[PDB]
Amino acid sequence: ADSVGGQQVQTIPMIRGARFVALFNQKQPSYFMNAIVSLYACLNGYLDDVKVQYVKFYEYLLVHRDLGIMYGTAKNKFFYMYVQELNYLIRFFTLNSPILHGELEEMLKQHTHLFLQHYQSKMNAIKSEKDVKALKNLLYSCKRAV
């Protein structure tokens, strides 16, 4: 409310509120594991370096893709987002538990590092008449894809 006029200053609470208010957009219901993981990542600051426009794309890669496996860097033994049966383990054991907390942070840290290094870097370097349109279409598709 005070931000609207006066050049909003981006404190950490604001840096994370915007991501939360931009993860809330969705078209189809989200599987519990995908939703809880994404909220946890934004809660601990893994998206502070991610622009608000690319949050949906970041979430899509986290859910439907695996950057660590793509670049041969993943070290987690069992905690992978493609294991859809981890949902009940997460329900029984909270994310803030030694069983899952260690691997969860490792995956989020690795995924965040790869995304910033490879994808967002190219996004900020888009200068063309067709690439911009392709990027815009991609972001809109990811908005209603997860």
Binding site: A1, D2, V4, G5, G6
Partner: protein, 300 residues
């Protein structure tokens, strides 16, 4: 119902008029506290400027003998909402109006207000964007233009606002006599016992060369202008914060008056609609007539 929602729309606008004004209060409570540093670092630059120009003269003899032009340089704010500062300054200027009055007001509001009100005395005005700090260069720009407006001027007078405290903003006047009249008074303060406090100061200037004296005169004149604009800014931000409180309360009173009419309207609307329905119900009951009862009355 539209009538009820008319009030709701009206209150909807009022409810956000407050938010925009509330954000403005926050904006103007940053700049007030940013310019509060002057409060600490003022009241010491103008010490020998007092001796140069401090002359508690009468308010009639100094304007009745206006042999040459008198150049007034009122200080006014660019943006409105400041309060009564500009209005008072205009009253202070209206009270001095003369045949030999030339105006070089400062600020967009000053230009617009003084251009329309006194149209054959206004010449042109100075405008500064409130982007940088009030510096010496701006003051030098005020003085240079003032001289070119009327070089053969009896006096150049700056009418500004002094910020005594957060809630006190008085009107102050720096009067700068031109070189000829200043050096004449400086000559009398030196030779004569009159003006004792200025005796040593005047003789210490007459010993030096003339160009130094002229530079001294211009330099201290600039400082006086710099103090006035600096103070007028601090009074401006302080006044706006106060004014932007008055608007909040006015917008709160309206919110309490349009809410009552909204809550009074819904109560009346419910009552009237219900009354209409019951009137129709009674009309259809009244028109109805019971027929002859076909029962065995004898067997009772």
């Amino acid at each position: 119902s539209g009538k009820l929602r008319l009030y709701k729309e009206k209150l909807e606008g009022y409810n956000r008029f407050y938010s925009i004004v509330k954000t403005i209060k926050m904006v103007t409570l940053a700049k007030y506290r940013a310019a509060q540093g002057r409060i600490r670092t003022r009241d010491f630059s103008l010490r020998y400027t007092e001796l140069a120009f401090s002359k508690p003269q009468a308010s009639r003899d100094a304007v009745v003998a206006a042999k040459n032009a008198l150049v007034y340089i009122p200080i006014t704010t660019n943006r409105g909402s400041c309060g009564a500062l500009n209005s008072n300054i205009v009253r202070c200027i209206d009270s001095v109006v003369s045949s030999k009055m030339v105006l070089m007001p400062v600020g967009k509001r000053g230009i617009d207000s003084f251009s329309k009100l006194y149209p054959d005395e206004f010449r042109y005005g100075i405008i500064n964007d409130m982007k940088e700090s009030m510096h010496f260069g701006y003051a030098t720009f005020v003085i240079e233009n003032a001289y070119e407006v009327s070089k053969d001027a009896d006096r150049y007078q700056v009418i500004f606002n002094r910020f005594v405290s957060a809630g006190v903003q008085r009107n102050a006047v720096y009067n700068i006599p031109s070189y000829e009249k200043w050096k004449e008074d400086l000559a009398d303060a030196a030779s004569s016992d009159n003006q004792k406090n200025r005796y040593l100061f005047a003789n210490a200037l007459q010993n030096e060369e003339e160009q130094l004296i002229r530079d001294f005169f211009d330099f201290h004149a600039a400082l006086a202008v710099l103090n006035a604009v600096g103070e007028n800014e601090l009074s401006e931000q302080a006044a706006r914060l106060v004014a932007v409180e008055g608007q909040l309360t006015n917008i709160s009173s309206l919110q309490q008056r349009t809410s009552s009419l909204y809550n009074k309207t819904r109560q009346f609307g419910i009552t009237a609609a219900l009354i209409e329905i019951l009137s129709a119900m009674s009309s259809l009951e009244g028109n109805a007539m019971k027929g002859v009862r076909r029962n065995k009355f004898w067997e009772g």
